[PDB]
TrEMBL record:
UTP binds at V69, I71, Y111, E160, R163. N-acetyl-alpha-D-glucosamine binds at I71, Y111, R163. Belongs to the ribosome-inactivating protein family. Type 1 RIP subfamily. It comes from Momordica balsamina. CTP binds at Y70, I71, E85, N110, Y111, E112, R122, E160, R163. CDP binds at Y70, I71, E85, N110, Y111, E112, R163. Guanine binds at I71, G109, E160, R163. Its EC number is 3.2.2.22. Cytidine binds at Y70, I71, E85, Y111, E160, R163. It is an enzyme of class 3 (hydrolase). This is rRNA N-glycosylase. Beta-D-fructose binds at G109, Y111, R163. CMP binds at Y70, I71, E85, Y111, E112, R163. Coiled coil: none annotated.
């Protein structure tokens, strides 16, 4: 398990949490020196538990699939909550069995569906450590509409920060003031699977991508990533989705 406490949190302690998150995901290979996540994992070892504590010391426990860093569900007090998707129903066979009831949320976990449920795109939702503290608090008491927005915050501040150093830095910039994500942030999120694929295809292609990846950069301009000499590859992405899962 890994843990993060918002009480007394600062950029450093958040850094230590994102480091622990990355370190808790198993891999046997690196590709261009980036951890390659496993194709699969059977049983309860598929899932990592993150204990998150809000400023007042109340906690939720979040279950994460270690093969793709997807949030499956969470436990808050004696109630479990899982996305409405087959992967989360499967996870419910292994985690939080001890819950007194199990609620299935009325959406799946994908960005599109969560934004519909929340009533807004994540271009308009501020993130940062204060937003994370709010999200933990929202998730303590069921309200599905409010939960959608909180899960957009939670996903971005945990999983997406684990995947990209740039996003981790963005959250560290927002330790004491929330701000909506940069377009660069949105772009990376949206490209994780594509990048993960093209970095893997690059291995027998002289480090050259088969298909370019289009990103928005830190200045707002759209750019093409064509090979592993790009900073995105050398100095940003921290985890690769296995092509077996793409
Ligand atoms: C590889 O990527 C860099 C940008 O990081 C670019 O300058 C270079 O032209 C690219 N080369 C090929 C062969 O795709």
């Amino acid at each position: 398990d890994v843990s993060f406490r918002l009480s007394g949190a600062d950029p450093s302690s958040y850094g230590m949490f994102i480091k622990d998150l990355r370190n808790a995901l198993p891999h046997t290979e690196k590709v261009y020196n980036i951890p390659l996540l496993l194709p699969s994992v059977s049983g309860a070892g598929r899932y990592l538990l993150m204990h998150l504590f809000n400023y007042d010391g109340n906690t939720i426990t979040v279950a994460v699939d270690v093969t793709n860093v997807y949030i499956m569900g969470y436990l808050a007090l004696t109630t479990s909550y899982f996305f409405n998707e087959p992967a989360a129903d499967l996870a419910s066979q292994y985690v939080f069995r001890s819950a007194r009831r199990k609620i299935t949320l009325p959406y799946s976990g994908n960005y599109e569906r969560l934004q519909i449920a929340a009533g807004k795109p994540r271009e308009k939702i501020p993130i940062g450590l204060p937003a994370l503290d709010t999200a933990i608090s929202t998730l303590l008491h069921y309200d599905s509409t409010a939960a959608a927005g909180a899960l957009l915050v939670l996903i971005q501040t945990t999983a997406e920060a684990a995947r990209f150093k740039y996003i981790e830095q963005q959250i560290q910039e927002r330790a004491y003031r929330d701000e909506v994500p940069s377009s660069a942030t949105i772009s990376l999120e949206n490209s994780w699977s594509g990048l993960s694929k093209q970095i893997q295809l690059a291995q027998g292609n002289n480090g050259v991508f088969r298909t370019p990846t289009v990103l928005v950069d830190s200045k707002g301009n759209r750019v093409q990533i064509t090979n592993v000499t790009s900073n995105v590859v050398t100095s940003n992405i921290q985890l690769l989705l296995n092509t077996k899962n793409i």
